Design a binder for this molecule. Structure first.
Ligand SMILES: Fc1ccc(-n2ccnc2)cc1
Length: 408
């Protein structure tokens, strides 16, 4: 019996920032007066693009006030143009409490869509930039022993350029920026750049701008108190191809960009995905800890090497990572296994939900029971699992995968 997934309209994107659809404005080897202050970086990144144009709504949010989203983006540009005229650039920028910002800051069964699998495939790929330093993974106080060191360097080589790792660092940056603003600027609608940092294949340091968030008032007394925010993220993805993915967004067309491509130079429209959203102190603390995804994934690999090692009365680290008893690798390479485990850990973090917690525990129970019947040859457990298959894309996709592990 395969699990029954729900019927209904396709599920929609619900992460805190864009994943496969993001777009970066970037500055190489940055060195302007104030390199390392988010606002200065963001402006220098904005100054690298000359294709801006009069923005308009191309995919409206069906349940919000689309003129207010438009006005909020035009306000961001207008207030950044103001900083261009102030002699000293300030360290932070508090937006005017306009009617559009006050409104935007607050002052059902869904079937499985194909985009979430595509998102997961993209998260497993390699980018052309590295996102972590060589000794990033780990917290140890002492120098690490020789075997642990070898394992960490092999694993880091495989995941440092991984797209899942860019999501980790992107998520760590924005969650740190927002939580700091949440208490350093409680009464302000602070403009908060979405920044990441990477090193190219030639060693060049690069600073990237994905867009902006504007936080609401944040008098966060406890871990569960909510700070609302508005996110505005560049993208080359035309939202009119998969409109169901963007149910929660108003999408603007805000410029045109010249690109290298397989057909040579091409001009493509640039979009801005805008939605309102919220987070809590506890969720931002968790978002600051996303580098533990790297550690949790490494430890799953170290578990497999420990198994093979205690079987051969010998350390199997070199033999595992160099692919030397097994005569292949199902995913295709050891690198893909590392990046698939990483991607699972990152998406569990980016798409955390009670639905995910139930399905994770309850489907493990159904698995062990099925494995014990397959090697050696329930209606209430099946219900506890399917009570978590409601509308969450990550959970629905993991259930789709579970059915495949059932048919085999
Ligand atoms: F840093 C920048 C600030 C504003 C604009 N801009 C574009 C259209 N109007 C203002 C561009 C770059």
């Amino acid at each position: 019996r395969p699990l029954r997934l729900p019927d209904g309209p396709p599920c929609s994107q619900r992460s805190k920032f864009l994943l496969m659809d993001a777009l970066k404005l970037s500055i190489e080897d940055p060195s302007h007066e104030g390199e390392g202050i988010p606002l200065y970086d963001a402006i220098k990144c904005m100054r690298t693009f000359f294709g801006w144009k009069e923005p308009n709504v191309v995919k409206p949010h069906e349940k919000g006030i689309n003129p207010n989203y438009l006005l909020s983006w035009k306000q961001v540009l207008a207030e950044l143009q103001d900083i261009e005229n102030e002699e000293k650039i300030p360290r932070t920028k508090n937006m005017k409490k306009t009617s559009q910002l006050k409104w935007a800051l607050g002052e059902e069964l869904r079937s499985l869509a194909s985009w979430i699998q595509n998102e997961f495939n993209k998260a497993c790929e390699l980018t052309d930039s590295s996102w972590i330093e060589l000794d990033e993974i780990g917290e140890d106080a002492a120098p690490i022993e020789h075997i642990a060191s070898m394992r960490r360097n092999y694993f880091t080589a495989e995941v440092s350029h991984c797209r899942a790792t860019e999501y980790i660092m992107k998520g760590v940056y924005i969650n740190t920026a927002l939580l700091n603003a949440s208490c350093a600027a409680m009464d302000d609608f602070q403009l908060i750049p979405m920044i990441s940092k990477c090193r190219t294949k030639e060693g060049r340091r690069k600073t990237n701008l994905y867009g902006f968030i504007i936080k609401g008032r944040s008098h966060l007394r406890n871990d569960t108190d909510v700070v609302n925010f508005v996110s505005m993220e560049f993208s080359l993805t035309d939202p009119r191809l998969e409109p169901h993915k963007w149910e929660k967004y108003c999408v603007l067309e805000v410029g045109d960009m010249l690109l290298r491509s397989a057909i040579g130079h091409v001009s493509r429209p640039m979009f801005l995905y805008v939605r309102t959203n919220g987070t809590s102190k506890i969720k931002m603390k968790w978002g600051m800890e996303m580098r533990r995804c790297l550690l949790q994934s490494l430890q799953q690999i170290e578990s497999m090497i420990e198994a093979e090692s205690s079987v051969k009365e010998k350390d199997m680290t070199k033999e595992f990572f160099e692919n030397k008893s097994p005569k292949g690798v199902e995913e295709g390479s050891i690198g893909k296994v590392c990046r698939t485990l990483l991607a699972k850990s990152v998406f569990n973090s980016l798409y955390a939900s009670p639905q995910l917690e139930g399905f994770s525990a309850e489907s493990r129970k159904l698995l062990l029971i099925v494995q014990a019947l397959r090697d050696n040859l329930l209606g209430g457990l099946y219900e506890a699992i399917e009570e978590c298959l409601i509308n969450d894309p990550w959970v629905l996709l993991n259930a789709s995968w579970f059915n495949s592990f059932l048919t085999h």
